Structure formats: C-alpha cells, structure tokens
Design goal:
The structure is cut from a larger assembly and holds two copies of chain A (about 150 residues), one copy of chain B (about 350 residues), one copy of chain C (about 150 residues) and two copies of chain D.
Chain B (H helix, E strand, L loop, with lengths): L28 E5 L12 E3 L2 H8 L8 H11 L5 E5 L3 H4 L8 E3 L6 H7 L7 E5 L21 E5 L2 E2 L10 H16 L15 E2 L5 H6 L7 E6 L3 E5 L13 H17 L6 E2 L2 H20 L8 H4 E4 L8 H5 L2 E8 L15
Parallel strand pairs in B: 1-3, 1-4, 4-5, 5-6, 6-9
Antiparallel strand pairs in B: 2-3, 7-8, 9-10, 12-13
Chain C lengths: L8 E6 L13 E2 L4 E8 L9 E9 L2 E6 L5 H10 L7 E8 L5 E17 L11 E7 L2 E6 L3
Antiparallel strand pairs in C: 1-6, 2-5, 3-4, 5-8, 6-7, 7-8, 7-9
Chain D lengths: L27 E5 L11 E3 L2 H7 L8 E2 L8 H10 L5 E5 L6 H13 L5 E3 L5 H9 L3 H5 L3 E5 L15 E5 L2 E2 L13 E2 L14 H7 L1 H21 L2 E2 L2 H14 L16 E2 L5 H10 L1 E7 L3 E4 L14 H18 L9 H20 L12 E4 L8 H5 L6 E4 L4 E2 L1 E7 L2
Classes of the chains: A mainly beta (about 150), B alpha/beta (about 350), C mainly beta (about 150), D alpha/beta (about 425).
C-alpha cells in the first residue's frame, strides 16, 4: 500500500510536464535542452612527482527551445530580428517541473541574461505528416536550481 | 540669427552659458521653490532637463541675484541630471504625484514640515537639508531644530563662488549634484563624501577637526571642508539618526534604491492568480536582481548565500488569512557594506 | 563598461574643407598609435633604479583597404601625388559608430600626405576581390568623443 | 478614384486604417451621437475601422438640426477602441433629441442583436451618460450583459440597477488631436426656404452654397466649440479604451484573467494625476483607476466591480460566470423541444460536463482535479419534482470555483 | 499593515521565520508555561514557527497574574526545535498554578 | 466539440502544404529547407571577473530546393547556367504555408536576393523505382517571416 502523498515525496519526477517562462511571459514549448554547466581543469606538475588539479573558468551556457508553428505567432523570430549591431534585449528564463494539473511547482531551473544566437525554420517537405517546428538557440550567463 | 530666411550661414555674438548633463536614475531631485517666482506660478510642477532648457524657459539672462538661478547652476555644474521644481507650499501634494523622485532637496527654503510627512519608511525618499547660516556654536546645540529622521541629512556651510553676490549658494543644491555624479560613477552604495565639489565653490566658513568633533554623533551635520592639497571636499556621510542601522547615508540610500528596483521588478505579478506558480515566478525575479546587485559590489559577502536571502511560501511568509485577502508576502534580507571612517597612524622609533 | 565592436566604422576625407561623400566605405583601417620616444639614463652610483627621459612624440601611419570601384576624389588626389605633381594635404576623420550610427569615438588627423598605393595580385586560381591598399602619413592626431 | 484604364493608379492622402482583430466573448455596443451615412434607430454591425468610415461619418461635430450644434467624442473613442485591440462591434446611433421613447427601447434593441456582451456610452457629457446608464434595466443586465462606465467623480461611486454587472473607471484620457471632417461630411437637416424643400440640403457644403447667412451662423458655433475643446484639452471618455482592453485580454490570456496591469496605447495624457492614498479610497469604493508609472506608462490599476462581497468583487470572476452561462445556454438550445424524459436529461448532463471539463483544462477553474472544480446535477428527485416535469420544466444545477487575483504584494526587508 | 490600494507595499522589520519540515514518525508535544493569544487547557496543533507566533505570544516572560511573574524558556526552546529540523508539533500550555487536576488530566489530553 | 474555425485559429500548422514563388513566377517544389538565421558571439573578460557577451555579425543564408524532372522543363538549370563571370540575375523567393485548397495564405518566409551556387542532377540507377529529382542550392542575404 502506497499513498499518493508518499509518491509525491519519495518517487522521482518525469520529464514531460513542464512550464517555461521567457522574460515576464510564459510560452508553451515542446522541447528544452542544453542546461549544462562546464568547468576547465588547471593542472600543475613538478619534478618530485607532485600533481595538482583545480577547477578552472566556467564556460558559457547554451540552450535550445523547440516550439510548433501557430497561426499569427512570430514572437521568437521577432526577438532574434531585433538585433541592431550588438544590442539586444536579454531575458531571464525559468523552466519548472509542474504538478500534473499545473497548479504546483516541483523544481525550477533559472537561466539569467539569455539572448538568441540562432533560429531554425521548419523544413517544408511535401511527403511528411508532421507539424512545423521552429527552434531557437540562446546564450546565457548562469544556471541555478531551486527546489520547491 | 533666430529668424532664418535664406540658406547659408548666420552669425550672432551671444554670451549665454553652456554646461553638460549626466544621467542618473537613483538621483532624481525635487527643488523647493519660493512661490513668488514668476516661472513656477500657475503650475503644479516644472521639469528641467538641463541648463539649456532652463535658460530657454526663463527667457532671461543669468541673474546671480536669483537664488533659484544659482542653485540650479551649482547643481548642474556638479553633474546633476533632470530635476523637478515644486513650490514649497505644494510639496505634500505634488511629490506623491511624481513617481521617479528620489531626493527631496531644500534649495534654501524651509521644508521641515514636508520632510516629516513625506520621508517615512517605505516611501523611498531621502531629504537634503541646509545647515545654519551663521557660525557654529561650540556647545553642540547648533542642530537642535532638526528632527532625528533617518531619511534626511544636513550639510554645512553655505557656498560662494566667483559669480556670487550678497546671497550665498545653499549647500543642498551642490550636494544634490554630488549625489548624481557619485551614483552614476561608483554606485549608490558608495559614500557621497571625500569627493571634490566642482566649479569655483568654496565654503563660507572654515571648519576644523575640533569643531566637527561635536557634530559627528547623534543628529550629525555633514561638513564641506578645504584641505591643503585636495581642494574642497565633502567631509561627512552620516544621517540624522545615530543607530547601528541607517547611521550612514550609503546604507539608507542603498536600501531605498533596492526597494524601488525590486518593486519595479516584480510589479508584473499584481492582478495575477495568488497561487504557488505565481510565487515561484516572483522569487525568480527577486533572486535574479539580488545576484546582479551582489555582482556589482553593492552587497557584503564572499558568496551570494552570505549577501542575501529570499523567502516566500505558505506557512513560511503568509497564512490562510493572508491568501484569502489577496495578500502575497515576501521576506528579503540583505547585508550592506559599511565604509571605513577613522584612520589611525601609530608612530614609533 | 560595455565594450565596443570593431566592425562598424566610417572615414571621411576633406579636400580644401570639402568632405568627400563617396570615400566613406573601407574594408579595413589600421589602428592609430602614438609613442613618446625615451632614452634611458644611468647615474654614477645608482645601480638599482632606472631613469627615463622624454623626447619627441612619434605618430603612426594610416593604412586603408578598399576594393576596385569607380573613380572618386580620393583616387584622383592619390594619382596626382604619385604621378609627380605638387604634394597636397588632406584631413581625415575616423569615426567609430554605435547601433544608432552615432560616433562614440572619433580621431582626427591633420595634413595627411598620400605616400603609397598598392594593388593585389592578379591570380588565375583565386576567388577574391581585387583590393587596393593605401597608406598616408599625417602630422598630428587628436581624438574626440565620449569613449576611447 | 474611378478607374478607367487597366494598370496601376497612384493616390496621395492621409487616411489611416488599423489592423482588425477578432473575438467572440467581448462584443461591445456603443450608444452615442453617431452620424450614419444612411438615413435608415437600428443597431449596425461594424467589423473594423475601415468599415466604420464606410458606413459612418467620422468627426467631432454631431449632425446639425435646423440652428443648434453639438460636440461629440464618439468617433475618436471608437478610434481608441480599435487601437487598443478591439474587434467587431455594434453601433447604436442616437439621432435628434433624447426622447424617453428611445431610452425605453434601448434594452430591446440591444437584445435584438444577439452577439452583444458589453455596453459602452462613449460621450463626454455627464448628464447624457447618466440618462443612458439609467436606461439599462436590471432584466437586461442580469441576462448576461456587462456595462463599462465612466465615473465622473473621484469620491462617489456610480449607481446602477445591477451593481455586480458594472465596472467604473477614472479618470478620462487626453489625446493629441481630434478627427476633423470636411463640410460635405457634416450632416445638416431641417433647412427650408420658399424655393427649396427640407430634403434638398444634406450637408454643410450644400448649405454653404445655398444660404451663406445661416452657414456663417453654423460655423460660428463650430469655431466656438473648437475653441472650448482646445482650451480644456482633447478629453476622451475612458470606457471606450477599456472595451478594447477587454477584447485583447480575452483573446490573449482568457476571460479568467483580470483586465488590469495592461498598458494603454494611443492616448497622450490622463485628465488627472492620482496618488496612492487617493487610489486607496477609490479602490475600496469600487472605482478602478488609470495610473501613470514612470517605468511602465499609462496602465489600468483596478479589477473590481461596483458590488463589494466575497462572490462578485472582481471583474474576472464575474465575467467568467457570464461567459460560462452563455456558452452553456447555447449548448442547451439544441434540447428545448426534446421529450422530457430521462434519456434527454442524460444528454444534457453529458453536454455540460464536457464543456466544464474543457474549461478546467485551460486553467479557468481552480482545483487539482475536475471534482474540485465543478459539478453538474439533474434528476427526477434531485433537482426537479414530478410537478415540474408535468409542466415541461427541466432543472439542472451547475457549480464552479474560480481563482481570485492577487491585489496586494507586501515586501518585508531586514537588515541582516 | 492594512492594504488599501492595489500594488506593492514596503515594510521594514526584524521578524524571523524558519523553513518548515514534515514527518509522521516524530511528532512531539510540549508542556510548559505558554501564552496563547486566545483564552480558550486544550492541545493546539502548530505547523511551523510562523503559525506558532500567529497563535501564541513569543517571549521569555510568562503571563502575569494579579503581582507575580515567572521566567519561561518555552518560546526559545521552540525556536531551537524548529531550527534543528522539527516539523509540526502540538503545544499544551499550562496556565495559572500547577494544580493536581491538571497533572492527572495530562495523559488523557 | 471543436469547430473548424477554432482549428484554423488555435491548432499548429503542418508542413506538407506550401507554395513557392521564385522571382515573379511560381514553381511547384517537393522539398524546401535551410532557412536558418545564425549570429556570432563576441565575448570580453576582465581581471576582476566580469564577462560580457554580445551578438556578432549575421551569417549568410543557404537554401536548397528539391524538384522532380519533368519533360521539356530545364528552368532551374538555365538559371545556374547563365552565370558569366560574377554576374547573375538575383531573384526574391517566398515560401508560404497555404490553405488545404490553396486559396488562402497562413504564413510567409521571404528570402531576398538569392542566386544559385550548386545544381545536383538525378542519379541514374537501373534498379531503382523512384522519380528523377533535381536539387538547386541558393545563397541569399536576408530572411523574414510575415504572419498573414
């Protein structure tokens, strides 16, 4: 006998239910990936056999968001098309694993100061039976995890 | 000249002044103006963007006998940004109408009543008073008429320059310019003292170490002194309340700026559902701002966990009654950095 | 503290106080440098410190790169000087532009003398644009602007 | 132009057209001094700004009756409505004098148009607006209609027949310029002389070339009105702006989202600058305020109705129930003349339950599962008795739970 | 505070709250000189430190009966309990004098 | 109960129905891909730990169109065979997602100043059961998305 409140406390969480906030607005997305943190390693060796290893500089964060094409919606392309020379509005991004009904947050990934670097349009294939999907690639500064 | 008829070059020989303007968001002052001034009569307030705009609206040559004219010149020559002119009798009515005003500057007027009403916790306002116009009493009772308000500061003495007459420049006008310059250069968390006063401004009376020793505790007065090599500097950064909190102007003004910036950051959450998903969105907005402030050096601590903390949630910051009433309660705690004030040299052979 | 990119710039040439509107596009402009020449002096008993004595100031040269195009006033001045005619001075204003085409930084050069013109090689195996290389020598340099 | 040859024609003008939006849950009706291009009192559907200019004469001068003239803000209020995200709308022009016969017919005329959901009176005159508001009977408002009203005072709330179905906003908004119309586009009627009948003069242009004496009489009043409106500034009632904001909010976020914290567009300034203490007094009394914030601009800062109770305090809660009972009523209209038996009641329960489940999926209702969000009840001994069924009655009980907005956010700062 | 206008309010204070934990196999009851905010002897469930301060008066001075006063460590001990990972708990305040009637009723309560 | 008008407003669009306009002429195609926008990233690090990131220059757009081989039709090969030395006719290209009957446009991708760079001929395989397909590759300047 296992009670539903026990599952919410002890069982792991699946990936398919999440909500994404871009800036101060929430947009439904189909796939989000790339939230990784990497460091370099600095090494030092000497003549008597010592060997030191330390963390180095943290690398930059890259994120890809995948979304379907809806009538009258070009928000993601309008963001990447606003780049003038080196100026663009940077937005904070939060991805949260959510309750099955969307009324409770389980865990949040916070991404700070993201701006778009690439935008992929759907491929028009006359023999396909899929939905037009656009993809946007972003570069950020930092990633943090906050447990609800 | 001003009448353009033919294409080509026009020659005129004028003598109008020309200055430069800065841009600081944490220092938007409002200047108390006497009601008898013709320019301010019949209007609630006037916004002045620079010396060029003020001269155009005045439609008169620079008059050194006008207290408003010299105060604006001293303020703008020190790097101040755009300001607001409000009559002294209308301060308690027009200041709440203005949303971006952060400093309440007494440009030679008496704003004791307005400060006691406007400068309160949560209002995000700081006041700049004027020190006594006479010599300083050595008994330590030259500051008895000031209220112990942690949202105000007093500066002494009044200033004079080359372009001066029987009237002397009020110190608050020049100090407000220093506030704009320091904030845009080194941040609002840095003390607005130990900085030169631009222009040819000089203090009217000399203040020594013995004189200042009396007025550096309790209801302290901030002094404008001249030193042998560094020229004229602002010497003092204490507010009117002597407490472990709000003793220093930087700490009080940093919290005022942080409260305003945070309030603008999470203002999107008003008229949203009062549920947990909204609370998480607000927490992300506050945490993102506080980390940015810590990165700039505005908070004390080697790591962000030592510099700030944010709490929001059910049975942590609010109860069932608060939620049913539409209230959402957040707790923010941040540590400010306090400057070094006394330097002691120990000599031995 | 936000730095400025180095791929948006403009240069203007004034001939007898008349700017040339057709000579503002260049593929590359070399950096401008000033150096204060010094000689090291050594005292008699001073064997641990160094003394440097100032001298005249040396200005660098101006190098420009541009593709082969229609004849412009800048070309005619360069041809006249290199044909053996009387030398003529020109004034050059180099400007670094921001996203609104506002010069954040600008350097002005007084009395610039055309001294060299070279062209790229005619290569039958290449895929490239024929590029002219010009060099000028000026008397003085001076920078104006809010950034530098 | 009139095209004769095939090819491309070139025209220079200044006519302005706006993008047309669409919606179903927010279709307002405007009652005011409009000037239709056709003589033939009846509600007219307008799909966009271009359609309005094709069917009505835009301008700030009401039709002239012979002389007297009137100043109207209806045309510019409609321009603000379309600039803020307004969709198709209905227009009810009031012609000649305001008779009691017109006022009594207003609820019936609106009901005849089956798509109306909002009622707006875009007129600057306070007395005219009060007469229109009083003409909306409680039967009309309780039938699923919502009234957006312009409060004329900062201290006293408006009084209407149904409080929970009304929202008031303050203050009015200024604009840069009014819409000016040529003489041919100003309707003129009532002129008559010995050689001409009353129907031979239709606009100001015809009046000018037939009798310059009365033409100078009319232009003096027009110039006098134009001077007066310029002195006080081009003030426009704010209810027309709010109608567009309702349409934009419903299409984007949904009916269950409060129509507040939205930035106004197309306006120049507000008629009065408000403080927080003043807004505190209005909000308790039920008057929503248009505020100015430096970092935002001009925004709507209220979501209350005129009724202050735990049920219908907020606009989104009231409007959501109006939308739900309207959509449910549409679903039950396919069952009106069905036999009154148990298989008919089962089909009714399925139709309502299917609709309510879809509402809960989008987030309109509160709860972690459908059983916490709604319920449907119908039966022979649960909701109706044997006498009701013998009389042809069918009774079904529906309950829903809504989500209230967050109105106050409190920050607690600590030194350590 | 009492909110009147919609928007954001700013308060300066020093009130401290702690993270709330949960559990089932360890729920303690505290018997001591507590000061409930309500007159109405009965065991009261407290979910967190915020709930405790909302239902009880925190302090080191027991309620005064008219005069005599008493020193109580109950409030500080509870703060230590929550700071060390405690979850919801029950509080049994003892009021006035320590009568034998109260002592006999403790196991039943 | 979902009405067709609701689907046209709220549902995502499939990829298999589209119309391609090359220049001022419309040509039926089988596959269109490559409409991607890319930017470089410019970074700057300092000694006190700052880290700045900005968008860089936009890269060029490459597009590939696929089409079957029809009798008497060599329009695509004629376009690439008209290159003289570095001169070629540049054409604008628009790809629109269309209504199921072809009488209404839903979304348009506009491609400006495209010229052919490569042409792939069908491969003649005697054991295959396919249709001869030609492919053309184009290089362009700009891509924009317009929502109908």
């Amino acid at each position: 006998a296992i009670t539903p409140e026990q599952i919410a406390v002890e069982y792991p969480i699946p990936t398919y239910r999440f909500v994404v906030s871009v800036g101060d607005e929430q947009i439904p997305f189909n796939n989000v990936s790339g939230l990784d943190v990497h460091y370099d390693v600095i090494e030092y060796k000497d003549g008597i056999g010592n060997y030191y290893k330390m963390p180095g500089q943290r690398q930059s964060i890259n994120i890809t968001l995948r979304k379907g094409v809806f009538p009258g919606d070009t928000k993601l392309f309008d963001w990447i098309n606003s780049i003038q020379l080196n100026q663009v509005e940077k937005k904070d991004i939060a991805i949260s694993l959510t309750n099955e009904a969307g009324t409770e947050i389980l865990m949040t990934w916070n991404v700070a100061n993201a701006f778009p670097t690439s935008f992929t349009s759907p491929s028009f294939d006359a023999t396909s039976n899929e939905i037009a999907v656009q993809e946007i690639a972003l570069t950020a500064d930092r990633v943090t995890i906050q447990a609800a | 000249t001003t009448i353009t008829t033919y294409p080509g070059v026009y020659i005129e020989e004028d003598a109008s002044l020309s200055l430069s303007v800065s841009s600081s968001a944490t220092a938007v002052p409002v200047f108390a103006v006497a009601g008898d001034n013709p320019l301010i009569s019949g209007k609630p307030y006037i916004r002045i963007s620079n010396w060029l705009e003020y001269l155009t609206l005045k439609n008169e040559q620079f008059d050194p006998a006008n207290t408003l004219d010299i105060s604006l010149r001293a303020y703008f020559i020190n790097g101040g940004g755009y300001c607001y002119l409000v009559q002294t009798t209308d301060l308690e009515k027009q200041v709440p109408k203005l949303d971006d005003v952060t400093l309440l500057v007494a440009a030679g007027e008496n704003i004791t009543t307005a400060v006691s009403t406007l400068c309160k916790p949560g209002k995000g306002l700081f006041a700049i008073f004027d020190g006594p116009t006479t010599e300083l009493k050595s008994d330590g009772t030259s500051n008895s008429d000031y209220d112990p308000n942690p949202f105000a500061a007093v500066y002494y003495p009044w200033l004079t320059a080359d372009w001066t007459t029987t009237i002397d420049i009020p110190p608050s006008a020049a100090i407000a310019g220093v506030y704009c310059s320091v904030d845009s250069t080194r941040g609002v968390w840095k003390a607005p003292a130990n900085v030169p006063i631009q222009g040819g401004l000089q203090p009217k009376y000399p203040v020594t170490d013995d004189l200042q020793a009396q007025y550096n505790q309790g209801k302290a007065l901030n002094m404008i002194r001249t030193f042998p090599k560094s020229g004229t500097l602002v010497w003092g950064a204490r507010t009117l309340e002597d407490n472990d909190n709000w003793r220093y102007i930087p700490v009080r003004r940093l919290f005022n700026s942080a409260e305003r910036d945070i309030k603008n950051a999470m203002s999107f959450a008003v008229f949203e559902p009062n549920s947990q998903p909204t609370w998480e969105r607000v927490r992300s907005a506050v945490n993102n701002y506080l980390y940015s402030l810590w990165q700039q050096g505005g908070l004390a601590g080697n790591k962000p966990d030592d510099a700030y903390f944010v709490q929001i949630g059910k049975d942590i910051t609010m109860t069932d009654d608060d939620i049913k009433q539409g209230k959402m309660i957040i707790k923010i705690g941040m540590a400010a950095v306090r400057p070094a004030e006394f330097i002691i040299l120990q000599f031995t052979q | 503290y936000t730095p400025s990119v180095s791929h948006r710039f403009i240069a203007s040439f004034l001939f007898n106080n008349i700017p040339s509107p057709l000579d503002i596009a260049f593929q590359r402009i070399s950096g401008l440098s000033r150096e204060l020449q010094t000689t090291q002096y050594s005292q008699g008993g001073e064997n641990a410190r160094n003394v440097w004595l100032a001298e005249k100031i040396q200005h660098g040269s101006l190098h420009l790169e541009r593709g082969v195009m229609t004849v412009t006033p800048l070309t005619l001045m360069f041809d006249r000087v290199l044909r053996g005619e009387k030398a003529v001075y020109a004034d050059v204003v180099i400007m670094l532009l921001n996203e609104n085409s506002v010069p954040v930084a600008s350097w002005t050069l007084s009395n610039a003398l055309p001294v060299r013109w070279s062209t790229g090689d005619f290569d039958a195996n290449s895929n490239a644009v024929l590029v002219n290389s010009l060099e000028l020598r000026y008397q003085d340099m001076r920078w104006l602007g809010v950034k530098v | 132009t009139i095209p004769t040859y095939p090819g491309v024609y070139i025209e220079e003008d200044a006519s302005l057209n706006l993008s047309v939006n669409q919606g179903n849950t927010a279709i307002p009706v405007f009652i005011g001094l409009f000037s239709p291009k056709n003589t033939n009192s009846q509600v007219t559907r307008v799909n966009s700004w271009l359609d309005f200019t094709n069917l009505f004469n835009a301008g700030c001068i009401a039709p002239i009756t012979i002389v007297i003239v009137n100043y109207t803000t209806s045309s510019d209020a409609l321009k603000l409505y379309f600039q803020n995200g307004g969709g198709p709308c209905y227009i009810l022009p009031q012609l000649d004098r305001l008779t009691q016969g017109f006022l009594d017919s207003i609820p019936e005329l609106i009901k005849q148009a089956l798509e109306i959901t909002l009622i707006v009176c875009p007129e600057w005159d306070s007395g005219y607006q009060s007469k229109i508001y009083n003409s909306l009977t409680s039967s009309l408002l309780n039938a699923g209609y919502f009234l957006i009203a312009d409060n004329q005072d900062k201290n006293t709330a408006l009084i209407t027949e149904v409080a929970s179905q009304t929202a008031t906003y303050y203050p009015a908004v200024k604009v840069s310029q009014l819409i000016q119309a040529e003489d041919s586009q100003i309707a003129v009627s009532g002129y008559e002389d010995a050689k001409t009948k009353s129907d031979e003069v239709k606009n100001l242009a015809q009046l000018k070339e037939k009798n310059p004496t009365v033409y100078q009489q009319a232009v003096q009043k027009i110039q006098a009105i134009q001077d007066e409106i310029a002195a006080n500034g081009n003030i426009i009632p704010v209810s027309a702006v709010m109608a567009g904001i309702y349409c934009a909010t419903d299409a984007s976020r949904g009916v269950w989202k409060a129509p507040a914290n939205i930035v106004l567009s197309g306006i120049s300034d507000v008629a009065e600058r408000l403080t927080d203490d003043e807004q505190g007094e209005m909000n308790s009394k039920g008057i929503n305020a248009i505020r100015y914030f430096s970092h935002k601009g001009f925004v709507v800062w209220g979501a209350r109705t005129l009724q202050n109770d735990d049920n219908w305090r907020y606009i989104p809660v009231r409007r959501l129930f109006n939308a739900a009972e309207r959509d449910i009523k549409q679903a039950m209209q396919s069952v009106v003349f069905e036999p009154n038996s148990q298989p008919t009641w089962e089909r009714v329960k399925s139709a309502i339950d299917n609709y309510l489940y879809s509402l809960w999926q989008q987030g309109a209702l509160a709860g972690n599962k459908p059983q916490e969000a709604y319920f449907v009840q119908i039966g022979k001994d649960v909701t109706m008795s044997d006498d009701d069924i013998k009389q042809g009655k069918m009774i079904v009980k529906v309950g829903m739970a809504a989500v209230r907005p967050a109105e106050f956010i409190i920050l607690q700062f600590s030194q350590q």
